[PDB]
């Protein structure tokens, strides 16, 4: 179980619903992290897309605590993310794009994030279906759940979820 960390986020992040819900005041992407740090075991969580207006690229994944908070997740070397619009996703890390996958998100979609620190992998799901191949492998160290979004998106966190 974790929530959004109100002390982790860019100041433009807006938390609500006992810190289970996030949006942003900015049209620029801003980061917020979860209250959990993972270093072992297998973790799965979901983000429900409460609101998706226009054509933004919210991003979902995991990060080091020192991730830059005022840019899309995966623009620096401290986050591993899937960014996704209404049409398609990309995987991003270190501002490098891999594995474009057709099929995106919309209001009512769910994004699932599977951080497997036994196998050292990060895998994404949309609406219960794996999105692309395993996104990143040989992932090591300590990760916090991460989100970036702007004012065109609102997401609600669902945690304490059984691994599929």
UniProtKB/Swiss-Prot annotation:
Residue span(s) of domain B30.2/SPRY: 1-164
Signal peptide: none
Transmembrane residue ranges: none
Subcellular locations according to the entry: Cytoplasm; Cytoplasm, Cytoskeleton
Similarity section: Belongs to the TRIM/RBCC family.
Name this protein carries in UniProt: Tripartite motif-containing protein 67
Species of the source: Homo sapiens (Human)
Stretch of the intact protein here: 609 to 772 of 783
């Amino acid at each position: 179980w974790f929530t959004f960390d109100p002390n982790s986020g860019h100041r433009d992040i807006i938390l609500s619903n006992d810190n289970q819900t996030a949006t942003c005041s900015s049209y620029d992407d801003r980061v917020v992290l979860g209250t959990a740090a993972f270093s072992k075991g297998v973790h799965y969580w979901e983000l429900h897309v409460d609101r998706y207006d226009n054509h933004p690229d919210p991003a979902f994944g995991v990060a080091r605590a020192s991730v830059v908070k005022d840019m899309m997740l995966g623009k620096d070397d401290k986050a591993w993310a899937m960014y996704v619009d209404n049409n398609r996703s990309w995987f991003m890390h270190c501002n490098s794009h891999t594995n474009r996958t057709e099929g995106g998100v919309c209001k009512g979609a769910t994004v699932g994030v599977l951080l497997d620190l036994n196998k050292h992998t990060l895998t994404f799901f949309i609406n219960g279906q794996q999105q692309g191949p395993t996104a990143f492998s040989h992932v090591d160290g300590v990760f916090m759940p991460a989100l970036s979004l702007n004012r065109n998106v609102q997401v609600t966190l669902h945690t304490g979820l059984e691994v599929p």
